[PDB]
């Protein structure tokens, strides 16, 4: 339309309408001109003594919008309203809007650096709707819409790794290059706006409740089982049985089993002595792939990293966030006091404890001459009639992940939590259209001098979520997420005296309970 | 209606109508007044040297109807008619009826103990249709409708365990209390009756056939494979191949694999020496959960506990029933002569043997200096292209189990056999409405003196089952379940001279065969 | 619309149409960027030796429009036309418009500080229609549309106090943070405008008349009462009566009583000696709240601060304005010559005098041995059959106050005068949308460098008022507000030689009289 008319309005809200809730968020973004308008091939060799660190890829001059964190859509208080009242939820639709664009030209003649706005410049924008480009959004990386609405953010630069050859920096004949200018995009001048809608594919509700019963003790403690059990042999070797009594859960027959587990190492937070001067890496859990060794946090779903009322944590089975945002490439050594360490202790009635052995079993064949022997195991995968709880979602965590296209997968639920999607919300890429400097003669060699500039604008995301109403018959009152602080020095989830947003705790999702 | 009119009739039957069969059972039940009308919080610490035995829960004054045993619906002879002719079956619907109620008041003045009937007293009854209460029915516990129709049974008391804290008797802030009087129930006087219907959710047919072929020998024994195999290296290290010949099953290429296995210990029944003076517990298979060690019979599906024509049994992978019903809390040491030990030997062509190693595999990397080494394994979970047979159903065993609500499970088929249901037949609870004794003054303190009483009545269950017709082209005659006894001293599955029902053998379900 | 077209026109007017009068005001406002775009948590401890001064709250980067002063809508001359002719009035509707916006960018490179206009920048605007935010408008604070139409004003910064803990600067777990960007707002570029309408809820007319009779002397001075009164006891103790004569008002029986009073201290203005070297604070009237002592001017309604034709003023029961506007945070010691001290002397026939005792009453029980004793009181609250006059409204005073939501209040009429409203004219907030400076690299840390800028525009308020026509039968002429000055050196309510607006007197509202 025009220069003196606004292309959209500010919307931040939450509208609860029974079975649905609609969240809206608007933020102000700024977009730098990345790479100075060109593609570069980026690469690395073996860094920090690990060739799993090697890669080969491309950085592009595009930036993208990333809103795959819950705090980008939920306020602390609406999150509390959700986890204290519902049993589950899932995303239904998405609507995005980019508007009020402003391109600024920057000129640094004689160290004066003046910023003027360029009314005729454009930004290009497109969404990759067929998933033809490497999807980098759901991998726990930075650059999402901020938690707090008044914050202004920088869009991150799009880049991707393709195939490297033999754990070195070199490409292979299969490494691909994707040119993003090879997709159709819209061009927007200062009076233009971009709009985009999306519907999620039917996914299972997240389970925002904790189990009120232990999986191995579902039998009625008042009645005995009509099943018996082998309990020994007499002085001659003949077998003897005993009836499974009422409430002797250590012996009853079971119908269901706990989920898969792979033992992780346990460390003590706060009080609780640990081995001094250790170097985690050398002894962490790894998986090999293409000849290299990778750490695999947070480990696959089906375990619990903490046992309620204990300070031992299987740290690599844990999501660890920082209480605040950090600068790029920081190598500082943070301590427990700076972190937001999550705990999955409310799944312990169903998920095995990560730092303990998973059980034991027969190692030999007993005979008149050999005594029965058993041996414990450290890992155990899926068996039939197995049940576990998926990892929890936090307000500061990720909403979805793309399920990789390979044609074969098992139980597509991402290790970091959230929804696993075949076709997730498409990537939205954006860049400042290049504007050439003063060029006076002809050359077949591509132009390399540009006017420096950047853009800024507003972005609105509108998500509809479907809720699963809590339907309990528990008599006594439940546990609820509550604002409880002893002698607060500042309000949590609010700006402090400096104006910086504070958050002292990770807020999970399981407060309500249910009988198994 | 009224005192002198009966509220229902007696129905026991079986109606076969092609693809369906409808069973009806009526029994006479008696209901004691449990706990003297009050809820109690029950609990236990570490019993028998195992804190997996600890719990915290509640007993209620309610009793419930449990008809989750096949012999509650099938006569020995109809069961035989089913397993000798069909390939499978599954439950379709359920209809329950409680009628002809009679409340009796018991007065023990001067050691005379007279029983009179109280025409104005009620029983309360309800079904938990939304599964809001801890479901205790499918956990192999006692108190089901009896096998034999003339038997009168006592309804069991409803109780449940909730969460205990740290393997001790104490509750946690998440432990829940469920008050059952907090549901809507019907009240029945002597002229009233209760009726309830239910439809099962589409489940897979049980497979009542044994495989006529071994899974590893599905190739035609007359033709060779067009695939080759590595057979050695020559004096220089160069690799050599050999064609896979006709009928050399030890080498053919396979497409499918046997199901998951976890080695269990094997013991000899009858003839066959075992290690003398053993104490099973210390070396049985265990799974850890919340810091405690639990035995897990019958182990997960996918194994066979016995090898046909052998007396070695992997006893913990076995369902062991008693030939007769036992008294509550018996600590007697039964011998093989008293038991009904089931055998899954007819799945051996597809399921690995529980007391043997599961296979072996590469442990190193061979080179000119090291010889290839291999190591056996004792457990192996699911892999792709795995096939196994679920555990069999017995006439004296369980029909269904509730699949626990956790949001994540794999292959919901219960270890003890039967159908795994998301929404199983709802629990039916019943209790004698309390009647206060002589109270002459007012008190804010709840009444604690009641008239003692009990009730009795009839209960009819009507189930429709769908059958899968056997469609074989086998030429020679099949194996059938048959009444074969050498010199019977009494008729089996009949009352003896005392009037007590006899059953000398577990009747499984696989007699018919099928080619894989 | 566009850059070269104006978004609205200038309207200043007054249209009298019988029973209604419509006022319109347009002003030019300027809006600074407050706090540099961020929220800050502001707080204070015990200041000036009083912990009632402690608080905890938040300043925001928003500013707001405040038109809750009568002089924002009335000219001195229309005010005179209102108070000389009507008996009352009340507000009926409100219409607001913000237009002709202009955002200016300010750059201070090399001490040149140049101001350019930025055609693409926005201001955000919204009205809090559900009263979800702390309402700070009706609390006698600065920043309203100016009295004189040519004046340009700065919008004040929105801030609020929430709960502090124990009269200290610390918050409590109940202290709330309100993010204003969490409401939906409009964005306006230089061609846009915002419009908003509101209807007041039916309120009682203000009473702009003075009583022509004294409340205790409503009886006809020509007739005696048919009631008698106790006047003494004879030498034996027997009681004696006397008839209440005609016009002896000191004794008649009364039907109605004066309003509530709490004694305030009286000081002499002009001529009239006061105690020398006093420090008011230590002896002013206070109310305790949460453990702290607060001064409570102007005291609750129902008293008169001055007795007509006297120079004694109960200064804390008085509204004291300054003859001119002052700078922020001035600690100057003003003298009577600089003030506009209001007087409520025209309510004296009905309201008790604040610096005098309120009356007296029985303190003992007389008997043959004790003489009747009495004791005066300093405070007396509401009794049944009590009548008083509310405080007057001045041209330089406040129009409305929000009645606090607590569920319980008595006679919601604000101490400072005006209308008390359940749902008052919603707050209108406005801010300059932030525009980021030159950002060249990505960071997850929020942007903190902005282009400095400010905005300006016009604002039009249109209020409809309903009038109550004066309907007197007084014969002789009334008192009227009149422009009377002996030897004027300058015209009052006009700009002086410097161009600054002068106002030498507070203009109340009661000139007309009425018989009680």
Author numbering:
A (entry chain A), B (entry chain A), C (entry chain A): 209 to 724
Describing publication, verbatim:
The PKD N-terminal end was disordered and pointing toward the five-fold axis of symmetry. The resolution of the reconstruction is sufficient to distinguish side chains that identify the domain as PKD1. PKD1 binds to AAV5 near the 3-fold symmetry axis spike, primarily to two of the variable regions (VR) in the AAV sequence that have previously been highlighted, namely VR-VII and a segment containing VR-IX. The C–D and E–F loops in the beta sandwich that makes up PKD1 contain most of the binding interactions. AAVR R353, extends from the end of PKD1 into a polar pocket between the AAV5 VR-VII and VR-IX loops. The positively charged R353 guanidinium is extended towards a negatively charged region of the viral surface near AAV5 E544. Instead they involve hydrophobic contacts formed by AAVR L376 and AAV5 Y542, L543 and A540.
The icosahedral proteinaceous shell is composed of three capsid proteins. These proteins (named VP1, VP2 and VP3) share an open reading frame and differ only in their N-terminal residues. We use a high resolution (2.5 Å) cryo-EM structure to analyze details of the molecular interactions that are presumed to be key to efficient infection and are likely to be relevant to serotype-specific tissue tropism.
